[PDB]
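Translate structure to sequence.
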């Protein structure tokens, strides 16, 4: 069964609201169907665009006012990531542009196996990332304290697309599905952080060689994989070196979760006092590829789900997972097993007492709702958020054909 406190929420639209009357009609219809809350990307690029610590919350106060007036709860996602920004993308909401003048690009960004630089979110390795998020959370808390009664939960963005991961798969870097993507530790800052991490762990270059079986003559010859595709088949993954690299690669995300979690708790616990959550990506493809098993997950930063989910527990953050609507396939060439992935992550979270919340990866309907229903009831989910509002209600406020199924399968699980 779903958890005793289960509620169904719906993600708001991607595009900035420019017709408030239309959005209000949509909100009324969702409320009339028993929807609990609206989840909302609160874009960093919208709210601190003019300068460091120069805030503009007015659009989101309007947004929150509309949600409140419709009798809905509001679940803000503090979205410290970029939306699109490449020609043809369906949004263009970059990080605040002044950030570029505050630290070195190398320390602030991600670089892939081929040298492609990605700026979808600030690197956890930048000294200024934690400080910037702390200021932003403080500002949110200060500006939205008067909205306490309508905010039941707050989400953090742990990286690209609001997910705690590396920007490992990116169309503008040459990626297309079902590519495993690429490791994202090729900035000098990342390479040096890995060298420093290994020197700290083993104590010297010679002790690193002792652990790895290598014959390096300087720390500067230590690098991330210089060929990611064959990282399993070439003995990389199974090697002491490969395990050290992947563990470290994941540890960067884990420390980041700790930092942003602590900043969120510090700013929110005495103002809102609600559950705070973050999201793990559903990297469901290349799971069972014989030549690169779990290659997509690994490039994204996922080496050990037990340990990663333990960090959620330690940081006292709830876990949102995705792909709840998808079925297992496992066939070449996609090697995609999202339903098994959901079971894996969900089972681990429940074993640890980490509260689960769910989302669909892609717009869905029909059988998608029955799959979501299976997951939320098998694993005692505390919430489900449907992406997105226009898949349930048209601009004029009329239901799509899917609202009925969403209501019958999902909303009906909630106590009103
Ligand atoms: Ca700031
Ligand atoms: Cl946009």
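Result:
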């Amino acid at each position: 069964a779903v958890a005793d406190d289960f509620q169904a929420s719906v993600m708001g639209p991607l595009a900035k609201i420019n017709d408030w009357g239309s959005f209000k009609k949509q909100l009324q219809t969702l409320k009339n169907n028993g929807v609990y809350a609206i989840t909302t990307d609160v874009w960093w690029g919208y709210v601190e665009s003019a300068g460091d610590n120069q805030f503009d919350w007015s659009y989101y106060k309007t947004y929150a006012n509309a949600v409140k007036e419709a009798g809905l709860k509001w679940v803000p996602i503090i979205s410290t990531h970029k939306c699109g920004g490449n020609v043809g993308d369906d949004c263009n909401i970059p990080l605040p542009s002044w950030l570029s003048s505050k630290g070195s690009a190398d320390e602030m960004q991600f670089k892939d196996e081929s040298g492609y630089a990605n700026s979808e979110a600030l690197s956890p390795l930048w000294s200024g990332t934690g400080k910037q998020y702390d200021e932003l959370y403080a500002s949110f808390a200060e500006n939205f304290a008067g909205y306490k009664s309508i905010i039941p939960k707050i989400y953090l963005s742990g990286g690209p697309s609001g997910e705690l991961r590396y920007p490992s798969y990116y169309p503008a870097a040459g990626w297309s599905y079902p590519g495993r993507g690429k490791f994202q530790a090729y900035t000098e800052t990342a390479k040096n952080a890995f060298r420093t991490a290994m020197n700290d762990k083993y104590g010297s270059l010679d002790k690193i060689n002792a652990a790895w079986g290598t014959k390096l003559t300087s720390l500067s010859q230590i690098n991330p994989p210089t060929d990611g595709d064959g990282f399993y088949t070439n003995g990389g993954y199974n090697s002491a070196y490969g395990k050290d690299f992947l563990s470290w690669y994941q540890s960067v995300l884990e420390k980041h979760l700790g930092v942003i979690g602590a900043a969120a708790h510090k700013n929110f616990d005495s103002v809102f006092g609600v559950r705070i959550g973050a999201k793990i990506s559903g990297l469901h493809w290349q799971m069972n590829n014989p030549a690169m098993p779990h290659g997509t997950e690994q490039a994204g930063g996922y080496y050990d789900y037990n340990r990663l989910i333990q960090k959620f527990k330690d940081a006292d953050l709830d876990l949102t997972f995705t792909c709840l609507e998808m079925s297992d396939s496992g066939t070449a060439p996609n090697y995609s097993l999202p339903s098994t992935l959901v079971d894996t992550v969900s089972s681990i979270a429940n074993a640890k007492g980490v509260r689960l919340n769910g989302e669909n990866a892609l717009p869905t309907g029909g059988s998608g709702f029955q799959k979501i229903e299976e997951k939320i009831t098998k694993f005692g989910y505390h919430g489900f958020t449907l992406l997105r509002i226009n898949n349930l209600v048209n601009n004029d406020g009329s239901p799509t054909g899917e609202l009925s199924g969403f209501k019958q399968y999902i909303i009906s699980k909630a106590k009103p």
